[PDB]
Design an enzyme around this catalytic site. Structure first.
Site, PDB file in Angstrom:
ATOM      1  N   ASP A   1      -5.329  -1.907  -9.316  1.00  0.00           N
ATOM      2  CA  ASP A   1      -4.825  -2.143  -7.965  1.00  0.00           C
ATOM      3  C   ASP A   1      -4.173  -3.514  -7.852  1.00  0.00           C
ATOM      4  OD1 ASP A   1      -4.567  -1.928  -5.040  1.00  0.00           O
ATOM      5  OD2 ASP A   1      -6.456  -2.960  -4.877  1.00  0.00           O
TER       6      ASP A   1
ATOM      7  N   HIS B   1       3.302   1.322  -4.814  1.00  0.00           N
ATOM      8  CA  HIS B   1       2.060   0.671  -5.186  1.00  0.00           C
ATOM      9  C   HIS B   1       1.133   1.643  -5.897  1.00  0.00           C
ATOM     10  CE1 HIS B   1      -1.633  -1.524  -5.197  1.00  0.00           C
ATOM     11  NE2 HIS B   1      -2.207  -0.533  -4.538  1.00  0.00           N
TER      12      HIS B   1
ATOM     13  N   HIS C   1       0.812  -1.204   0.000  1.00  0.00           N
ATOM     14  CA  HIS C   1       0.000   0.000   0.000  1.00  0.00           C
ATOM     15  C   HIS C   1       0.852   1.263   0.000  1.00  0.00           C
ATOM     16  CE1 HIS C   1      -3.487  -2.583   0.611  1.00  0.00           C
ATOM     17  NE2 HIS C   1      -2.670  -3.295   1.365  1.00  0.00           N
TER      18      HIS C   1
HETATM   19  C1  LIG Z   1      -0.582  -1.990  -8.632  1.00  0.00           C
HETATM   20  O1  LIG Z   1       0.602  -2.232  -7.856  1.00  0.00           O
HETATM   21  C2  LIG Z   1       1.650  -2.820  -8.506  1.00  0.00           C
HETATM   22  C3  LIG Z   1       1.575  -3.168  -9.849  1.00  0.00           C
HETATM   23  C4  LIG Z   1       2.726  -3.494 -10.541  1.00  0.00           C
HETATM   24  C5  LIG Z   1       3.957  -3.458  -9.907  1.00  0.00           C
HETATM   25  C6  LIG Z   1       4.026  -3.133  -8.558  1.00  0.00           C
HETATM   26  C7  LIG Z   1       2.880  -2.873  -7.808  1.00  0.00           C
HETATM   27  C8  LIG Z   1       2.966  -2.575  -6.361  1.00  0.00           C
HETATM   28  O2  LIG Z   1       2.023  -2.676  -5.586  1.00  0.00           O
HETATM   29  N1  LIG Z   1       4.251  -2.361  -5.864  1.00  0.00           N
HETATM   30  C9  LIG Z   1       4.350  -2.093  -4.408  1.00  0.00           C
HETATM   31  C10 LIG Z   1       5.680  -2.568  -3.817  1.00  0.00           C
HETATM   32  C11 LIG Z   1       6.782  -2.135  -4.731  1.00  0.00           C
HETATM   33  C12 LIG Z   1       6.540  -1.938  -6.102  1.00  0.00           C
HETATM   34  N2  LIG Z   1       7.667  -1.220  -6.685  1.00  0.00           N
HETATM   35  C13 LIG Z   1       8.565  -1.007  -5.648  1.00  0.00           C
HETATM   36  C14 LIG Z   1       9.815  -0.371  -5.676  1.00  0.00           C
HETATM   37  C15 LIG Z   1      10.542  -0.236  -4.504  1.00  0.00           C
HETATM   38  C16 LIG Z   1      10.056  -0.741  -3.307  1.00  0.00           C
HETATM   39  C17 LIG Z   1       8.836  -1.395  -3.269  1.00  0.00           C
HETATM   40  O3  LIG Z   1       8.291  -1.914  -2.129  1.00  0.00           O
HETATM   41  C18 LIG Z   1       9.013  -1.740  -0.907  1.00  0.00           C
HETATM   42  C19 LIG Z   1       8.063  -1.536  -4.441  1.00  0.00           C
HETATM   43  C20 LIG Z   1       5.339  -2.458  -6.649  1.00  0.00           C
HETATM   44  N3  LIG Z   1       5.259  -2.916  -7.904  1.00  0.00           N
HETATM   45  C21 LIG Z   1       6.459  -3.301  -8.656  1.00  0.00           C
END
Ligand SMILES: COc1cccc2c1C(=O)N1CCc3c([nH]c4cccc(OC)c34)[C@@H]1N2C
Length: 304
Positions: free
Chosen positions: A230, A83, A79
């Site tokens: 989402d 995200h 979240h």
């Molecule tokens: C609709 O949501 C997503 C759809 C496609 C890719 C997503 C997400 C999502 O919820 N996310 C959320 C989590 C995180 C993301 N990217 C990040 C980069 C650095 C740190 C992270 O988490 C600590 C993330 C991360 N990704 C790749």
């Protein structure tokens, strides 16, 4: 401090959508700095003609984007700002590459992009579970008595903060309509509300009675679109989805059964959604194709 960040953001060249790859469903954010995700966000507002049509001052849009990002800083990974940034990117890709843009009015597009960015701002406010660590989407349904919620108060508060008012150029009637759509699109990211209303959406599509020009079906379609965005990590190229799925185990916050968790997740929630979305808009097929390929990779892993 953070004047530094805003100054640096507002002065920077905003690269093209094509350079940033934000029109691709395969978009990966990991190599981008937070500040680059803000530039990507500016580009999304710009190429949807929202900056032009609603006369958004560049500094104001920059500050609003940084206000949104700052207010995610204590959220769990599922979240967090990344995200919401990726929820917005999927929305943009589905509006552009998926062509949904043409089916909607500018106020709908404006509310959708703001909702995508803001829908998890209250995650710590309306939840006493779910905030210690990232929990699987379906932990809502099977693990806790009380489910996982979203709200729009923080969203509207940031939108009305001095220096952050990206909506000041709307008329009063346009403003009212936009806030209403923002509120519904944010509430639609509650998985409970998706489950409660999806069967009707599917019936209409099955019976080939889906009529986007009906006010109840437009509300319902915008809601399914929010859920599609989402949950869109389930559609990503395999390395992205694997590392996101494993955050239920790997997130450090101040993997054995994951394959079967994700297959169950795809069978109970994700596959129908992207199937239904692809019948409304055939150019959203890459979301469905990605969700299919991931089920196959997770199934192969579950067979150990
Ligand atoms: C609709 O949501 C997503 C759809 C496609 C890719 C997503 C997400 C999502 O919820 N996310 C959320 C989590 C995180 C993301 N990217 C990040 C980069 C650095 C740190 C992270 O988490 C600590 C993330 C991360 N990704 C790749």
């Amino acid at each position: 401090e953070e004047t530094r960040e805003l100054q640096s953001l507002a002065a920077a060249v905003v690269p093209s959508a094509q350079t940033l790859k934000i029109t691709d469903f395969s978009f990966s954010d990991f190599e981008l700095s937070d500040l680059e995700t803000a530039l990507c966000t500016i580009r999304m507002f710009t190429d949807l003609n929202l900056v032009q049509n609603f006369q958004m001052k560049h500094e104001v849009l920059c500050r609003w984007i940084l206000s949104v990002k700052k207010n995610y800083r204590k959220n769990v990974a599922y979240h967090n700002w990344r995200h919401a940034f990726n929820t917005a990117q999927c929305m943009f890709a589905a509006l552009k590459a998926g062509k949904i843009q043409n089916k909607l009015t500018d106020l709908e597009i404006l509310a959708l992009l703001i909702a995508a960015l803001s829908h998890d701002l209250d995650h710590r406010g309306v939840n006493n579970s779910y905030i210690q660590r990232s929990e699987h989407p379906l932990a809502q349904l099977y693990c806790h008595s009380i489910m996982e919620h979203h709200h729009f108060d923080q969203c509207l508060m940031i939108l009305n903060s001095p220096g952050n008012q990206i909506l000041s150029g709307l008329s009063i009637e346009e403003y009212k309509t936009t806030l209403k759509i923002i509120k519904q699109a944010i509430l639609a990211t509650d998985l409970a509300l998706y489950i409660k209303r999806r069967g009707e959406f599917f019936e209409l599509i099955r019976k080939n009675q889906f009529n986007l020009e009906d006010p109840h079906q437009k509300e319902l379609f915008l809601a399914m679109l929010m859920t599609a965005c989402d949950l869109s990590a389930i559609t990503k190229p395999w390395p992205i989805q694997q590392r996101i799925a494993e955050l239920v185990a790997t997130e450090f916050f101040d993997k054995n059964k994951i394959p079967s968790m994700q297959v169950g997740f795809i069978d109970a929630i994700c596959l129908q959604l992207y199937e239904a979305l692809t019948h409304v808009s055939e150019d959203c097929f890459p979301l469905l194709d990605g969700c299919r390929k991931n089920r196959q990779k997770w199934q192969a892993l579950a067979e150990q």
